Design a protein around this ligand. Structure first.
Ligand code: NAD
Ligand code: NAD
Lengths: 344, 344
């Protein structure tokens, strides 16, 4: 059934307020949920909300955190999240990264002790919309093997990079994993194969069967190269004192304290070639790319284009499945709220 | 014959000094060349030296650059190379990025109007060997299509990421191109297919045939994802005012004035979780990986391990072909040096 985004925002706010989350913290959280559902990253949108409820009750999410800047300098900071909503910590960190970059040209803000923050692209787009370059990375509970290995050690480790000109936007937002676990589960319901070169089974051997893949490992994307970048990311994400490797828990499991890290970077074009000079060049490059000769059955896209298109289509509502609408009804009921104020 | 590391250094120094390069700048340049050759990155080793001679002679390399820091903050800087040797400008650029990271936790330095700087890893490791995290990116002449296209726009756009713990080091140094043209025509003369997804037709169709490859267009490394990264590199590399896209000239062709860009980033763990604790975590991560279970006919390796084993195996000198010997013989002859002083 169709769920209007504004109504998704009000649903999340009213529910989070019910657990003590201050209104401004709640509004912030919702925005990042709505962004994901609008872009089609549906697995980091509302459908993930019940998991948040589970964690709030088990007290793995602190509704009223003491967010602290434990280390600071003109160009860097470390932030302790106090087990608060990743969105709230995340926005603070990146907002502070942006502030520092405006003063001295670049800002690097690492976080520890926060929860999963949703889609990385939201944060680096905060930078883009200040006329800057935003870069965001984080790690994850183990999901992927080293290249040539069969054990789950690395996270799905996303990186997001955003910036824009006068006409074009650039918004790379990607997991270093070659496939989401959700898309494997999904493929297991719909009794089909997963793409080739996306997972290996219990044995280190390649596999297209979803059931095997689920007890095996997902592969980093671009062979040894993509593995290398996921390793780099596992590490850089954690420089504020988070865990790495197998000690990273609690990113998708509400029964565990969250131990992952996030890095937020903001580079400020005014300190280099100049803001207006940069925007002209981004435009010129992306325009060149966009107008180059297509291969056979393709239309050349800029990173981010697909997500923007999704948002347009989805601005007036998007579908959600019954089983989730049910989980919502229930949560709403517990907190003395009417599911019908939001989904109608 | 066999070329020994020491004699390659001498050879390069003597030749460059001959052109008015100051000895200290020659020594730095020789060092990157020898690094390229010992690691096995032969396309950036002494193999490339004859073109530097052509460039110097045509005036596209300035043996005596007035290298200027044109903009500076406490975390950022733009350096203009006055068409100097890329190695000379690069070292100064990365060392400045490092100095600033020493004071404020991070240093980002962009370059413009400098030449090809050899392997990106060298500059990243300077940071690593100061107990920091080094990141280098850079531009090149159009070498590959955007994803879904069939026309050269993106350079091979390398990235180098380096850092270390106490026992383990991490040194990723990699082109965003699926494959090097070099290896394709070595697959042609070798008659073997090249891997899949690497390149497209003279028509825009996928092809594992080196002959069609050679007529077509190479692709970035990781599907859309690899493509997105390389597009980001193409742009970020050039925020110091460099060119982008097809405006990037002279990184392979000694008849063109070079217009590429470099970005140097240095991140200091002292301003985050702390130096010693970061080295412990690096080791904790890299040990876990290096000792997780391998796949069947595989060994698990950390980015940098291959080059390290290479540098070990080629300390006593390495092989060069008759062709390069001859180029090098003439170069020496016209300068009154004697090739026999170096390849005895
Ligand atoms: N917080 C976490 O724990 C966590 C972990 C992993 C991933 N994630 C998120 O999941 C989301 C989805 O990731 P994904 O890897 O499945 O994304 P994709 O669905 O793999 O999208 C990745 C990027 O590639 C680009 N792209 C795809 N096809 C393209 C084409 N034909 N031409 C040009 N560009 C193209 C897209 O625009 C997009 O920016 C991400 O936004 C990420 O932030 C979050
Ligand atoms: N300055 C310039 O203009 C310029 C431009 C492009 C490239 N380059 C350089 O060319 C060189 C070639 O790079 P490349 O991409 O062809 O090298 P690869 O041989 O393609 O190297 C990529 C990385 O993958 C790693 N690797 C390979 N196999 C692995 C495995 N089994 N497990 C773990 N890691 C593994 C390697 O250690 C290496 O660091 C690079 O050093 C790059 O810096 C320079």
């Amino acid at each position: 059934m169709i769920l209007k985004p504004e109504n998704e925002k009000k649903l999340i706010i009213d529910v989070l307020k019910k657990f003590g989350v201050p209104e401004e913290d709640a509004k912030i959280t919702a925005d990042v949920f709505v962004d994901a559902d609008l872009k089609g990253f549906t697995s980091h949108g509302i459908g993930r909300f019940p998991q948040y409820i589970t964690a709030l009750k088990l007290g793995n999410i602190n509704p009223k955190p003491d967010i602290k800047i434990v280390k600071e300098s003109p160009a860097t900071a470390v932030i302790d999240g106090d087990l608060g909503l990743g969105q709230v910590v995340g926005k603070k960190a990146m907002e502070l990264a942006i502030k520092k970059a405006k003063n001295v040209g670049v800002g690097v803000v690492a976080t520890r002790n926060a929860n999963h923050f949703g889609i990385a692209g939201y944060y680096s787009e905060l930078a883009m919309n200040q006329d800057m370059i935003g870069i965001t990375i984080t790690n994850t509970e183990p999901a992927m093997a080293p290249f040539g290995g069969k054990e789950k050690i690395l996270g799905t480790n996303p990186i997001a990079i955003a910036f824009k000109g006068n006409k074009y936007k650039f918004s790379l937002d990607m997991a270093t994993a070659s496939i989401a676990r959700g898309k494997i589960l999904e493929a297991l319901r719909k009794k089909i194969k997963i793409p080739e070169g996306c997972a290996v089974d219990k044995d280190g051997k390649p596999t297209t069967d979803p059931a095997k893949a689920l007890e095996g490992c997902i592969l980093p994307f671009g062979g040894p190269k993509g593995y290398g970048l996921a390793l780099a990311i596992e590490m850089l994400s954690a420089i504020g004192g988070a865990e790495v490797g197998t000690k990273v828990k609690g990113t998708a499991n509400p029964e565990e304290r969250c131990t992952k890290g996030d890095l937020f970077i903001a580079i400020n074009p005014e300190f280099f070639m100049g803001k207006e000079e940069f925007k002209r060049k981004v435009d010129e490059l992306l325009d060149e790319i966009k107008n180059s000769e297509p291969a056979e059955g393709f239309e050349i896209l800029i990173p981010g284009e697909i997500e923007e298109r999704n948002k347009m289509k989805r601005k007036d509502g998007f579908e959600i499945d019954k089983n989730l609408y049910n989980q919502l009804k229930e949560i709403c009921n517990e907190l003395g709220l009417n599911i019908e104020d939001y989904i109608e």
